[PDB]
Symmetry: D2
Amino acid sequence: EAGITGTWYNQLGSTFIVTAGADGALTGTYESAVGNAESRYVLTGRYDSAPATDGSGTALGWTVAWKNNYRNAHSATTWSGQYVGGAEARINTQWLXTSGTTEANAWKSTLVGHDTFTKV
Amino acid sequence: GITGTWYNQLGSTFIVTAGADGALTGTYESAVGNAESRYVLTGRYDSAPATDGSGTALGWTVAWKNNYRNAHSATTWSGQYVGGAEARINTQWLXTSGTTEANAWKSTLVGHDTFTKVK
Amino acid sequence: AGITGTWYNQLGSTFIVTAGADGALTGTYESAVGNAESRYVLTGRYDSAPATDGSGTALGWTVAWKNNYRNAHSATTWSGQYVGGAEARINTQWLXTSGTTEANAWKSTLVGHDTFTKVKPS
Amino acid sequence: EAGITGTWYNQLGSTFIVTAGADGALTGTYESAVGNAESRYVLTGRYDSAPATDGSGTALGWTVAWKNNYRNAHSATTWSGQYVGGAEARINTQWLXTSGTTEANAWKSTLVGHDTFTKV
Ligand SMILES: O=C(O)CCCC[C@@H]1SC[C@@H]2NC(=O)N[C@@H]21
Ligand SMILES: O=C(O)CCCC[C@@H]1SC[C@@H]2NC(=O)N[C@@H]21
Ligand SMILES: O=C(O)CCCC[C@@H]1SC[C@@H]2NC(=O)N[C@@H]21
Ligand SMILES: O=C(O)CCCC[C@@H]1SC[C@@H]2NC(=O)N[C@@H]21
């Protein structure tokens, strides 16, 4: 997809390099400006390869597990959201970060936030 | 010990392979909502989890489009796998529907699914 | 019957609530976990005229995690529904926000789900 | 503390009128510019009345049940957040809306988002 494929950046300065395949796949890398993270991490996702043409955005999602060759955070984040094309295009997301925990700590495994991505 | 067939409390069926270098790939069949048959899923998991008996962090996405139906929709599950005795994948989820900018504020459902090895 | 009661969640926390007749929820919350001890004030609101087709009764409430013993600089809100019947239940999802710097604001917020029954644990 | 009490507005045009009591109570009204809402609704909540002084925000939250004299949506929204001071005062929140549903529809009961409130 000739909208989503690209390098994006969020309000935190993280970098989201992604390819939208014509089968609906998202593949690429993510580098977080914050948290227990360094360099690039593999990502994978899906998006709607045949969106409605009524002004609606294009639904998508992706996952990072925060292990690469330099560092393991024992944690993973999913972003669920939509691509808004056109003028200044955006990916608006909400995200769930889950840490590996004990059964006793499982109640505090999950952070929630919103990230917004632009090409600038 | 993730690879296999898992079921959530709604009767949905999550068929998944955990590749050696952290990939999750497979299919999801939802028992509810605007869905029929299988959907592709991909995701990631921590292939080197802490061995202090913490669960294994993971997540996956399904875009709700296959050859039968397109809900203009995508869900991510974020969670952890706990093995052993009565093994479980405990998740929370975010479904975003495609909406106009005017209805963006209501784009997103939230919930929780517990997946288990027994139906 | 109803919401007014002493409720307990899967964690063993204790939710003592009164449902006032024009929508108010008042009571105390004691958490078994986290940076907290003893009871905390809560307030909240509920649908005082639910549907009558089986639909649950929508509600929510807030606890700010400051009492006389401790201050966590935190607040949780539970959003959910009361289901009546065989064993009354309050299913919830909750959002805990800590006071953070502007720089740490991205990580201010935990999310979970708490299910409450009237059954005491031991 | 001082700064919460007042009239606030979020990015959707909604109006949040709130009084912070010195004991940690929040009371007031909430007019939503969207959804199945009309006119004012009662809110209550709580805030950390003795917040840290390292410019950290003040934790807070409130509830609105969407029933007033005009209308009943069979639903309730909680906002959880923090107040942040200075020349650009704001209340940054994430919110959960729960609709009353049948037991079969429990899984789809809850909507999530984020509101940013600004001091006029
Ligand atoms: O610290 C960890 O557990 C791993 C790094 C997490 C960074 C988070 S994920 C959501 C948010 N968006 C970002 O780009 N960074 C943070
Ligand atoms: O209706 C749609 O938009 C597509 C199907 C959504 C079904 C939801 S996603 C979360 C939840 N868990 C399931 O197993 N199914 C539902
Ligand atoms: O640690 C804090 O900041 C205050 C205590 C938080 C306890 C959380 S709120 C959600 C979950 N459910 C409970 O009953 N307790 C924990
Ligand atoms: O439609 C309903 O069920 C009642 C109105 C809900 C309004 C929502 S709640 C969060 C969001 N922020 C607002 O100010 N309004 C919407």
